[PDB]
Amino acid sequence: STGSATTTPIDSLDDAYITPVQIGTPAQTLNLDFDTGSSDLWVFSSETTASEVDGQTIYTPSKSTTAKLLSGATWSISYGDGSSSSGDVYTDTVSVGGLTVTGQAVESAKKVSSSFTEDSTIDGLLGLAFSTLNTVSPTQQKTFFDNAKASLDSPVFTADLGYHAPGTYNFGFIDTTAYTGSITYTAVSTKQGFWEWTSTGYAVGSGTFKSTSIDGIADTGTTLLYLPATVVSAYWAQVSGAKSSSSVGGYVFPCSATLPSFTFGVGSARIVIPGDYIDFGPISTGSSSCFGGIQSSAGIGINIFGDVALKAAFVVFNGATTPTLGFASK
Ligand SMILES: CS(=O)(=O)c1ccc(CNC(=O)NC[C@H]2CCOC2)cc1
Question: Among the four 2, 69, 198, 223, which has the fewest Cβ within 10 Å?
């Protein structure tokens, strides 16, 4: 089997991407944030505290003839941005782009943090990291990819995120029309539950490539590119008037600037992030200070190849017995 679904930026800055997901019988279609940095499929629901729902589409398990309460199971997750959600668990039929999993754990939110409530466009998350991070207790549950894997033509999914445009998530096949050149594969560590890999280095604009190992995660659920402070300083030093602002919470730059590109290494290959991809617009409406798309990881504890980086590539999440990541230009 295979699946193919379009992923659409939630706003004009590509702050996140939503992909329609069919849940239950008859189908209830929710727009979920596909997150290769977490392992829970959770949704706004008929159980979510009413005051915490503000425009999201909800899953109502009582209206699904295939929904089953997973008795005694609860979940609770806290994300790197400080947001959180928790609730109980159903199993139900979940389809993405034509690919169907029966008995998928659908984590029904009873509580969500303010950032979730405040974002009307995201109806929940679909985690695509390794199932070892799944928060369901007392019986840990499998991701949608882990449940689908054995049925897929090839045990892979691919992320093809658009810059200011829709893109695609494919399951079970590699669309050889979707990228240029060849796919470079690189080793993955699953020891922290993430798609964790080591970049071979970077370049700023037309600058010379610096060969240096940068361990980090491929995380579709994080907007920006978070890298060591040395690398980030080298980038923003090339932008007149750029500075790190403690009050704003990262590097800002004059909105009048033309940003340089950023290149990262994948083995001997190179992925180039155009400068425009690094512009996240005014810090506040009407400001001439713009927020940068490359930020320090120093306060995180891990480097994160988020959407800014991943949207410059066609990315293969290879779930073979030994997982690997693939990157191609496009
Ligand atoms: C409420 S929301 O904006 O829809 C949302 C979606 C997904 C995550 C998962 N990503 C994440 O935690 N990234 C961590 C990085 C960003 C900061 O700290 C480092 C968090 C929040």
Answer: 69
Q: Is the minimum distance from the CB of 304 to ligand 1 under 6 angstroms?
A: yes
Count of structural domains, the chain: 2
Same domain, 217 and 314: yes
Give the residue from 242, 280, 236, 241 showing the smallest Cα distance to 260. Answer: 236
**In one letter, which amino acid is 257?**
A
What ligand 1 atom has the least distance to the C-alpha of 79?
12
CATH of the domain at 17: 2.40.70.10
With b meaning 16 or more CB within 10 Å and e meaning fewer, what string describes 235-265? bbebbeebebeeeeebbbbeeebebbbbbbb
Q: Look up tokens 């690094």; give the residue.
A: 278
Instruction: Give the span between the Cα atoms of 315 and 159, in whole angstroms.
Output: 5
Experimental determination technique: X-ray
What residues make up the domain containing 75? 5-174
User: Which residues touch 246 (CB under 8 Å, ≥6 apart)?
Assistant: none
The answer to whether residues 157 and 182 belong to one domain is no
Q: What is the bridge-based pairing of β-strands 124-127 and 3-9? A: unpaired
Q: Measure 220 CA to ligand 1 centroid, in angstroms.
A: 10
* Cα(265)–Cα(263) distance, integer angstroms: 7
The residue type of 284 is S
Give the residue whose CA is nearest to atom 9 of ligand 1. 221
Give the three-class secondary structure for 131: helix
Shortest-distance atom of ligand 1 to CA 224? 16
